[PDB]
Design a binder for this molecule. Structure first.
Ligand SMILES: CC(C)=CCSP(=O)(O)OP(=O)(O)O
Ligand SMILES: [Mg+2]
Ligand SMILES: [Mg+2]
Ligand SMILES: [Mg+2]
Length: 521
């Protein structure tokens, strides 16, 4: 495979193989107790090894379904029901929210006594986030579960169990990124006395092994950044190359995706610079020229651009033409049209923002946001990821992406929202209206708290839609759908509060890229 301990690794190569095999045997063990089998799969996934046993995990889930599994314990234990529900759906299996109806009273509410078992509550909570539109029971399940977890103290349950709850409350499993979940779960798993030493070692090894790939990737990308040295010449621009790669890892963590990673990290870096040129540095007349230049994509015309924009455009022009050349050489297809198109759209979105600002405009939430998620660069990032993740491009798919299909628009919605939500307070208090939350206030004539709650709910409804795209009725390949969704995941993991906001970030970036995980004891 493209991720085996032979294609990547190479004696450690031998230690990995032995451990990996042992785990496979465990997932495939047909004499295993279903509940134990599911908790195994759960650990393997949280620990970050799920991709390596993708096939095995399905095999297991299939035998579980084909035999009905514990179709009787779906009335006996909430924990099992929730875990099985979450895992089955996670893997495309069909499951009904009615599998929980047997946990509600006459009035139609989850029994109170359930709160006693803090484990089953966490499992239900986690399962609620994989809901679709219409599944009210799951919506109620989350409201019910959070009400209990909120109160839980370290004393009531214990240091270990409490960390689990605070972790879930911070960000649900379904929404956190694979790597971020991995670093946390490993540290948490290595502390357990009953921790599987074989699995623990594989997790550690595999994590550091992949992490090395990242460093090698960020290494070449940095080579590029330096030669381009766009930040050093543009005294106003900010450098965010490392921040960009970290972002990229969220979107495409699988090692085999170095391409997609470098492609997103480069794009995000450029989005950063060009973003500033539009809302802080350039004048409308200049932005107007830049926008026009991107649309024409003519190098023999970069002379109509002011010095600094000329330097910026050329760097962009080449980087893109370079990506196009790669595809041509590897796919025998000319994808330049689509790529340059994505940029024309983003710049026009950026220009729309610049104009609204200069003209003191106050567009309705609907209009502002409709432009905001496009100016987030999310859809552009995905369009680029598409060509880097799928080996066989289909005319039909690219056309849909070009028209901003829900597969990339939806996750972009969240991206923009999580962002504006972070800057909401500051920008609002600073008298600014250039913020989704602010528009929602003015448009609905409501307080900040109310506006914020609505943004949150809007996000929840978006997730439900995304979950449907992933479950079924999709034109795109599941892989890309998960990549698209990853952008939403990364947005949730990137815009937070914390310790210090800037502190939790520095830590994560170091835990995800720089520093490896402490060796196995
Ligand atoms: C566009 C991105 C992803 C980052 C720069 S921060 P921002 O979203 O406030 O910038 P704009 O609203 O596009 O001017
Ligand atoms: Mg901007
Ligand atoms: Mg900005
Ligand atoms: Mg903003």
């Amino acid at each position: 495979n493209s991720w085996d301990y032979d294609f990547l690794l190479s004696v450690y190569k031998d230690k990995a193989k032995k451990l990996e095999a042992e785990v496979r045997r465990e997932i495939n063990n047909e004499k295993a107790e279903f509940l134990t089998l599911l908790e195994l799969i759960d650990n393997v996934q949280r620990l970050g090894l799920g991709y390596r046993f993708e096939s095995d995990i399905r095999r297991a889930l299939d035998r579980f379904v084909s035999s009905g599994g514990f179709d009787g314990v779906t009335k006996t234990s909430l924990h099992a029901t929730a875990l099985s529900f979450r895992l089955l759906r996670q893997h495309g299996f069909e499951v009904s929210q009615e599998a929980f109806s047997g946990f509600k009273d006459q009035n139609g509410n989850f029994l109170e006594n359930l709160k006693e078992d803090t484990k089953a509550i966490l499992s239900l909570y986690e399962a609620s986030f994989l809901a679709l539109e219409g599944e009210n029971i799951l919506d109620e399940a989350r409201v019910f579960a959070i009400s209990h977890l909120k109160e839980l103290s370290e004393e009531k349950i214990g240091k270990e169990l409490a960390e689990q709850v605070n972790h879930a409350l911070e960000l649900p499993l379904h929404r956190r990124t694979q790597r971020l979940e991995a670093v946390w779960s490993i540290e948490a798993y290595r502390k357990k006395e009953d921790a599987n030493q074989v699995l623990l070692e594989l997790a550690i090894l595999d994590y550091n092994m992949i992490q090395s790939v990242y460093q090698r990737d960020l290494r070449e990308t940095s080579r590029w950044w330096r030669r381009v040295g766009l930040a050093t010449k543009l005294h106003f621009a900010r450098d965010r190359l490392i921040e960009s790669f970290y972002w990229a890892v969220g979107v495409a963590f699988e090692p085999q995706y170095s391409d997609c990673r470098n492609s997103v990290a480069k794009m995000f870096s450029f989005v950063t610079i060009i973003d500033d040129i539009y809302d802080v540095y350039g004048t409308l007349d200049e932005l107007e020229l830049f926008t026009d230049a991107v649309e024409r994509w003519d190098v023999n015309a970069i002379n109509d651009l002011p010095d600094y924009m000329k330097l910026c455009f050329l760097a962009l022009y080449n980087t893109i033409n370079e990506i196009a050349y790669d595809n041509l050489k590897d796919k025998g297809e000319n994808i330049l049209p689509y790529l340059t198109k994505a940029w024309a759209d983003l710049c026009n979105a950026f220009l729309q923002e610049a104009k609204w600002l200069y003209n003191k405009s106050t567009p309705t939430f609907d209009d502002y946001f409709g432009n905001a998620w496009k100016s987030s660069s999310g859809p552009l990032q995905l369009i680029f990821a598409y060509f880097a993740v799928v080996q066989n491009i289909k005319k039909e798919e690219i056309e849909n992406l070009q028209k901003y299909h829900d597969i990339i628009s939806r996750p972009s919605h969240i991206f923009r929202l999580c962002n504006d939500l972070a800057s909401a307070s500051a920008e609002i208090a600073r008298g600014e209206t250039a913020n989704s939350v602010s528009c929602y206030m003015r448009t609905k004539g409501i307080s900040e708290e109310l506006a914020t709650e609505s943004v949150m709910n809007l996000i929840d409804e978006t997730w439900k839609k995304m979950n449907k795209e992933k479950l079924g009725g999709s034109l795109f390949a599941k892989p890309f759908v998960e990549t698209a969704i990853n952008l939403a995941r990364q947005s949730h993991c990137t815009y937070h509060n914390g310790t210090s906001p800037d502190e939790l970030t520095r830590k994560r970036v170091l835990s995800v890229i720089t520093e490896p995980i402490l060796p196995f004891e």
